[PDB]
């Protein structure tokens, strides 16, 4: 069920396997793209951060992104665009006291968690080119089969 932990790496995750991300203090936890219609990046914002512009390197480019976290939880900013020419938009947020995030390829979609623990749930981004989505994972991570999503969900929401 819980395969890991693996060290930071760059690879194309197989379909129907959750990547469970376990950051320490990395600013950017994951950068995923197929170079056609998916660019997704997860940023990590520590507790009690007054709204401010921070610099992040996404897919080799410096971006200035305004972040805020008025909670005692960690926030994963899900940044997204569907073309190489576009700027990133803040698409979703996962607010978490477990400091865990997830990434899954399945059913022509990329899936992530959002909302607030312990009631975080999943949502998708569409793609015509799922198989070519490659992830640079900058944290330790685990691999969980999609059939075991009940466990992954549990880990996301209540921790390891």
The Cα–Cα gap between 129 and 144 comes to: 22
Query: How many angstroms separate the most distant Cα atoms in the chain?
Result: 40
Residue partners of 60: CB distance under 8 A and separation at least 6: none
> Cα angle at 30 between 26 and 36, to 5 degrees?
150
Number of C-beta neighbours around residue 33 at 10 A: 19
The Cα–Cα gap between 104 and 141 comes to: 13
Q: Do residues 28 and 138 make contact, with C-beta atoms less than 8 angstroms apart?
A: yes
Half-sphere exposure at residue 124, Cβ-oriented, CA atoms within 13 angstroms = 9
H helix or E strand, kind and range, residue 149: helix 149-158
Domains of the chain as residue ranges with CATH: 2-160 (2.60.120.200)
The Cα–Cα gap between 121 and 66 comes to: 24
The Cα–Cα gap between 138 and 70 comes to: 25
**Token reading at 45:** 């914002």
The Cα–Cα gap between 84 and 39 comes to: 8
The structure tokens 């008025």 sit at: 70
**Token reading at 44:** 């990590």
Q: Is residue 103 helix, strand or coil?
A: strand
Going by C-alpha positions, the residue among 74, 81, 82, 133 that lies closest to residue 98 is 74
Residue partners of 7: CB distance under 8 A and separation at least 6: 140
Q: Do residues 141 and 7 make contact, with C-beta atoms less than 8 angstroms apart?
A: no
Q: Do residues 114 and 108 make contact, with C-beta atoms less than 8 angstroms apart?
A: no
Going by C-alpha positions, the residue among 61, 86, 88, 62 that lies closest to residue 77 is 88
H helix or E strand, kind and range, residue 55: strand 49-58
The Cα–Cα gap between 62 and 65 comes to: 10
Kindly provide the resolution of this structure in angstroms, with one decimal.
Answer: 1.8
């Amino acid at each position: 069920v819980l395969d890991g932990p693996y060290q930071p790496t760059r690879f194309k995750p197989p379909n129907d396997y959750w990547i469970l991300l376990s950051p320490t203090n990395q600013q950017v936890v994951l950068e995923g793209t197929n170079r056609t219609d998916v660019w997704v990046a997860l940023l990590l914002v520590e507790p009690n951060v007054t709204n401010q512009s921070r610099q992040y390197t996404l897919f080799g480019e410096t971006k200035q992104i305004t972040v805020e976290n008025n909670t005692n939880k960690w926030k994963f900013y899900e940044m997204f665009r569907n073309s190489a020419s576009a700027e990133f938009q803040h698409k979703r947020t996962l607010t978490s006291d477990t400091k865990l995030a997830g990434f899954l390829k399945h059913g022509g979609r990329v899936w992530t968690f959002y909302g607030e623990t312990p009631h975080a749930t999943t949502d998708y981004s569409s793609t015509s080119n799922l198989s070519e989505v490659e992830t640079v994972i900058r944290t330790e991570f685990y691999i969980i089969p999609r059939s075991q999503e009940s466990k992954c969900n549990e880990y996301i929401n209540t921790g390891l």
